[PDB]
From Swiss-Prot, chains A, B, C, D, E:
This is Acetylcholine receptor subunit delta. Belongs to the ligand-gated ion channel (TC 1.A.9) family. Acetylcholine receptor (TC 1.A.9.1) subfamily. It comes from the Eukaryota. The chain holds residues 276 to 298 of 522 of the full protein. Pentamer of two alpha chains, and one each of the beta, delta, and gamma chains. After binding acetylcholine, the AChR responds by an extensive change in conformation that affects all subunits and leads to opening of an ion-conducting channel across the plasma membrane. It is found in: Postsynaptic cell membrane; Cell membrane. The chain crosses the membrane at residues 3-20.
Length: 23, 23, 23, 23, 23
């Protein structure tokens, strides 16, 4: 579950930069 | 699972402020 | 897992209204 | 877990049509 | 869980191309 929460976190920042460009 | 649902919740609000700027 | 799928569902509609405003 | 991955898939397409309108 | 993280990854890229068009 450790590497599983680390992989989901990566995609998390991927969505962050998303709102950054659209915002 | 407690801290796991608390970490996902944080990102949840992160997406909320997202629709706020785009909306 | 029941309340866990009910909490994720709530955020689900939260994203729905999101595409509604942006769409 | 079967119906759990089928419920998440539904929301998946819900987000797809989202990028479709915004794109 | 292996095929489960591979199915979620697919949708991941699905959201990526999303910010690409909107950005």
């Amino acid at each position: 579950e450790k590497m599983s929460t680390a992989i989901s976190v990566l995609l998390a920042q991927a969505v962050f930069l998303l709102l950054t460009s659209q915002r």
